[PDB]
């Protein structure tokens, strides 16, 4: 919930070195291929039958920008990480019925994709910080599961 | 379990690893200890400080078993039953920690092999490490 | 995976169920909907009110699949392949709800056979339900 | 979670028809039996080698008794699970290093042990009432998990 400003500077300084739109597209696409039951929530999105189809699915990329942009906002208020996502936890819990364990899985994809794009510069310290960000975002998207 | 596609991607992916295994196995452990510090309580006797002789030599052992698992996919309970006894009977590792370690391994392969770490390969490897986890965490 | 005593306990426990399995499945589903009502969303076409004829006849189905699984413990992937197509490929059930139904089924068994639901039998059946769950939520 | 009075009356009503020391002793024992890696947290307890040894362990009985006392203390403050489980949450977090996922395993063992003792009186409605309680206890045990 609270990073050291060393960790905080690590996340914002490496976020500036990636293009958030393809971070979201790849992460959401990698969730769908690695944890394919997640596709059940995406039937209006068209073809999700294979890895290449998910990666070539135009609405999956479009939805990754929505996901990643709201994630970007989370990176601007790491201290009130709960309030920015309260509309989203509202929406995933009560209208879509996404099990809260799956929020961790998408955050793991964001971490794996950051490593993919950044190579050596995604050090264990870089991951340690970003793990804290996705852990807190995931718990935030779960605050309304009763 | 795995599919023929998953089995094909595992051998192929591990095949493209080569002599890098021992290195990846140590970096994975180093990523786990740094991201998930409670995992360090499983190695109270180890150095576990960044750069370490013991953690590096232990990463090789982790990398060796995975290579064995990667070529024995149709019989993991047999080729991993010695390792099951250590982690499940002896150490009693909490299953949650095998997911943390699995995750750091995929970060390592993503960080080192961009071009080969495709979403399909990623998917097959997550089932690979999850099958290995199940055996290593199971009593039997 | 399962041990010899798991297999023995699962088979022993399954024998004591007898013709009550059809009802134990119907009760397990009803307990799953009553406690975890978001699992109703997997059965929109069902009357899921308690005592519904549809849940009754479906508990008999789930039952028949569990007894089949209990007598083919070595190779669940083969004997449940057609059922893995249903729950994974087309239905795409989140693995979490198998844990839910597994728990409700063990609640049912504890609620109907107290002298037979020993801690040892319980541990074996939990692993039994974990093995069938892994088979059905696999291969999308 | 918040409970309707019909659910509070159901939970407190059925609680007064079991003896908690049996529930606690049986729930902790079944946890260690069903989920063997939880034994790792109980090395000063001695023999946990078999289901036989576990359910015969006198320290297990003793600890299940104290666990059920705290659970019972939660049953009287359902609308205050945070504050009532603050002390035990930080102990499990910072000292014991107990992964928070395991709180729900013990909670589930409490449900199953109630069904064992109560038979058909542990109705599906009875289960859903108790399921809400243990999920609240499990949540409260794990939000001061920094
Ligand atoms: C960190 C994790 C996540 C974030 C930040 C996030 C964010 C968002 C956002 C901003 C929307 C916009 C709503 C819209 O305009 O339609 C959305 C919708 C949606 N999300 Fe996520 N989400 C996350 C996790 C998940 C997971 C794990 C699932 C399912 C496995 C999921 C499934 C959906 C679905 C089905 C929609 C509606 C899509 C549509 O109807 O257009 N989300 N999410
Ligand atoms: C798929 C994942 C893993 C694999 C393949 C693996 C493999 C191994 C191997 C090959 C050894 C050496 C056995 C020997 O010396 O004969 C070992 C030891 C050990 N492992 Fe793992 N392991 C895995 C996950 C974990 C996790 C998650 C933990 C704890 C968080 C862990 C903790 C240990 C410990 C404490 C030792 C003893 C080290 C020593 O005494 O030298 N392992 N493991
Ligand atoms: C031990 C675990 C399970 C077993 C053995 C099992 C078994 C079965 C069987 C035998 C059928 C009927 C197949 C046929 O004759 O056509 C079926 C269908 C179905 N199952 Fe399950 N199942 C399990 C878990 C679950 C869970 C956890 C869910 C959802 C939460 C679920 C949802 C469904 C649905 C929606 C159908 C379709 C029924 C229909 O369309 O009428 N299953 N399953
Ligand atoms: C419903 C969930 C739980 C409740 C209500 C609970 C409650 C308690 C209580 C009352 C104590 C005694 C503290 C004292 O007397 O000072 C305790 C200590 C302890 N708990 Fe739990 N606990 C829960 C879950 C767990 C889990 C899941 C684990 C491990 C898997 C665990 C492991 C321990 C240990 C090892 C101790 C200390 C005993 C010793 O050091 O000998 N607890 N807890």
Residue numbers in the entry:
A (entry chain D), D (entry chain B): 1 to 146
B (entry chain C), C (entry chain A): 1 to 140
Question: What did the publication describing this PDB structure actually write?
Answer:
Hemoglobin is a heterotetrameric protein consisting of two α subunits and two β subunits, and each subunit has an iron-centered heme that reversibly binds oxygen. Hemoglobin transports heme-bound oxygen from the lungs to all of the tissues in the body via oxygenation-linked shifts in the conformational equilibrium between the tense state (T state; deoxygenated) and the relaxed state (R state; oxygenated). Populations of deer mice that are native to high-altitudes in the Rocky Mountains have evolved a genetically based increase in hemoglobin-oxygen affinity relative to lowland conspecifics in the prairie grassland. The most common hemoglobin variants of high- and low-altitude deer mice are distinguished by a total of 12 amino acid substitutions–eight in the in the α subunit and four in the β subunit.
We solved the crystal structure of the highland hemoglobin variant to gain further structural insights into the molecular mechanism responsible for the evolved increase in oxygen-binding affinity. The type S highland hemoglobin crystal contained 2 tetramers in the asymmetric unit that were connected by intersubunit hydrogen bonds between subunits C, D, E and F. Although the UV-visible spectrum of the dissolved crystal solution indicated the presence of carboxyhemoglobin, we were only able to assign a water molecule at each heme based on the obtained electron density map. In addition, chain H (β subunit), did not have an assigned ligand, as there was no electron density supporting the presence of a molecule of carbon monoxide, oxygen, or water. A comparative analysis of the highland and lowland deer mouse hemoglobin variants revealed that main chain displacements were present between α41 and α54, the loop region near heme, which resulted from a α50His→Pro mutation in the highland variant. The analyses revealed that αPro50 in the highland hemoglobin variant promoted a stable interaction between αHis45 and heme that was not seen in the αHis50 lowland variant. In addition, the highland hemoglobin variant had a reduced intersubunit contact surface, particularly at the α1β2/α2β1 switch region. In addition, highland hemoglobin has a reduced subunit contact surface at the α1β2/α2β1 interface, and this difference in interface area between the lowland and highland hemoglobin variants is similar in magnitude to the difference between oxygenated and deoxygenated states of human hemoglobin. Our structural analysis revealed that the highland hemoglobin variant lacked this interaction, and also showed that the α1Cys34 side chain was pointed toward the subunit interface, allowing the interaction with the β1Pro124 main chain oxygen atom.
